[PDB]
């Protein structure tokens, strides 16, 4: 078993490394948003 | 907006015409469950689930004799909410054959939260074996205070009023008890034409 703080760090590192490419927390303008 | 889009929308409208035609054809059919604990005799004289389709006097309705699954009642019983009746079936020639389990099942079904509007038909199957077994031996053993007599008709009426008593806190559903004597499918015919009238008088809005 790995330390749960290390797994917490890994999940928050994956959380912060894809905040730019998320169309449902920082929405794109309606020029490209296909609906 | 080329010809492709217009062809696609005309295909969509043909699909919706067929879909609505099949839907309307579906709703003039009386879906009916067949819950139980002698179901085979009943479905004869009238894996997974089996649907039996039969027509009476210009009114064909299906009948869903579930019971081969035996997995859990809590997880797939809510797909049965829209249904007209429940042909429950209990043979009453098993009062002392090692009936309390059947009463527990009826208590769990009749009080269920998805079935507060479904009129539970009930059938009591084996009566000849019951009258022979009551002529030979008494039924004062299921309860120590069960019957105050030992004739056929008092015992039968006591059992019938014992099953109809478990209907807890409902004045919206109506148990239609019978005894399984042409005139065995006549009864579900004359007791499904009494729940669709109750439903029409709620449809046009009258009570």
């Amino acid at each position: 078993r790995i330390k749960v703080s290390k797994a917490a760090a890994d999940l928050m590192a994956y959380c912060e490394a894809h905040a730019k490419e998320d169309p449902l927390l920082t929405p794109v303008p309606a020029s490209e948003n296909p609906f | 907006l080329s010809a492709e889009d217009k062809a696609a929308v005309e295909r969509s409208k043909m699909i919706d015409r067929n879909l609505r035609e099949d839907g309307e054809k579906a709703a003039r059919e009386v879906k009916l469950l067949l819950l139980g604990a002698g179901k085979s005799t009943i479905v004869k004289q009238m894996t997974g689930i089996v649907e039996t389709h039969f027509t009476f006097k210009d009114l064909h309705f299906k009948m869903f004799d579930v019971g081969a699954q035996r997995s859990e009642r809590k997880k797939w019983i809510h797909c049965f909410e829209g249904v007209t009746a429940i042909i429950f079936c209990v043979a009453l020639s098993d009062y002392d054959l090692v009936m309390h389990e059947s009463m527990k099942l009826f208590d769990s079904i009749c009080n269920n939260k998805w079935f507060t509007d479904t009129s539970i038909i009930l059938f009591l199957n084996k009566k000849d074996l019951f009258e022979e077994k009551i002529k030979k031996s008494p039924l004062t053993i299921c309860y120590p205070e069960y019957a105050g007599s030992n004739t056929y008709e008092e015992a039968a009426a006591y059992i019938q009023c014992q099953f109809e008593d478990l209907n807890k806190r409902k004045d919206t559903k109506e148990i239609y008890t019978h005894f399984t004597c042409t005139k065995n499918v006549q009864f579900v015919f004359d007791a499904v034409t009494d729940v669709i009238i109750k439903n029409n008088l709620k449809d046009c809005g009258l009570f």
Partner: protein, 310 residues
């Protein structure tokens, strides 16, 4: 959960029903987005499995079933195959890109005893099903026989979720025990028990090394496959009903849970807060899927309406 309070939370989320897909008559238990991010399927008790286009909101196919009791559906990663299963104890497979115009059934997988809860494709050659007789499986379409059967629990399996690399899945069951399986060998590897009642839906965190469990006692939890224990429970004190479906977002920051008090929610999957409610559904919601591109959700419900958000 203790470490993230130095991270700025998401403020609030506003989502609007950008379409509404109309045409079902009975209730709804399913949907599955393609990898196209374009076409969805939906399965109902009319006996109809309808493939919808999510841009023009009109039908492409209206597949007629035989057993009108479906509880799950699947849409292949090759865009060719749909699957359906339910109380018939049979997983039917239909093919779309055929020589003729009409649609037809390819293979009738007929080897279970309980009903069907899920089914998810792997290739156009491997489908993994989960059932109500406490056993998953793994099938083979042409052969017709199951090449691996997982019998690891007592509770009936209710959900299923393949990994991003499609090498090992996860299944939670009616005995609150969520197992992590392995497709190659064919036996369980860990079992997590943290829930007080049974389990209605599970999906992986999109990385592939965590998963989220939605139970029937108004709580969700987030388990990890390397620390092997609960990290958060998400619960609000004003909930009675039970979760019915669960899905994630592409960045792993929103956890959308399909509750049973008539409306979905959005859970901050790192701070355990409540972001914003997908309100307005009339009856219970049954299913919701985020696209692979991550541009929408499409919640279905017993109201006969399949609505597409944002």
């Amino acid at each position: 959960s203790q470490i993230t309070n130095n991270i700025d939370p998401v403020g609030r989320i506003q989502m609007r029903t950008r379409r509404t897909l109309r045409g079902h008559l009975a209730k709804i238990y399913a949907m599955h987005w393609g990898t196209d991010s374009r076409l969805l399927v939906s399965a109902s008790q009319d006996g109809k499995l309808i493939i919808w286009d999510s841009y023009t909101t009109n039908k492409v196919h209206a597949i007629p079933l035989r057993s009108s009791w479906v509880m799950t559906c699947a849409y292949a990663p090759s865009g060719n195959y749909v699957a359906c299963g339910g109380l018939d104890n049979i997983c039917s497979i239909y093919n779309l890109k055929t020589r003729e115009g009409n649609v037809r059934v390819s293979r009738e997988l007929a080897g279970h005893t309980g009903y069907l809860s899920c089914c998810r494709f792997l290739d156009d050659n491997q489908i993994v099903t989960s059932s109500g007789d406490t056993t998953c499986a793994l099938w083979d379409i042409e052969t017709g026989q199951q090449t691996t059967t997982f019998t690891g629990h007592t509770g009936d399996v209710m959900s299923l979720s393949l990994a991003p690399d499609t090498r090992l899945f996860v299944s939670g069951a009616c005995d609150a025990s969520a197992k992590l399986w392995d497709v190659r060998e064919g036996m369980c590897r860990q079992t997590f028990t943290g829930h007080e009642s049974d389990i209605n839906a599970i999906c992986f965190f999109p990385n592939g090394n965590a998963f989220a469990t939605g139970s029937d006692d108004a709580t969700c939890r987030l388990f990890d496959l390397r620390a092997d224990q609960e990290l958060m429970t998400y619960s609000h004190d004003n909930i009675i009903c039970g979760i019915t479906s669960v899905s994630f977002s592409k960045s792993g920051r929103l956890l959308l849970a399909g509750y049973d008090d008539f409306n979905c929610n959005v859970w901050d999957a790192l701070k355990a807060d409540r972001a914003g409610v997908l309100a307005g559904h009339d009856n219970r919601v049954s299913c919701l899927g985020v696209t692979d591109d991550g541009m929408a959700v499409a919640t279905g419900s017993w109201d006969s309406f399949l609505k597409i958000w944002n």
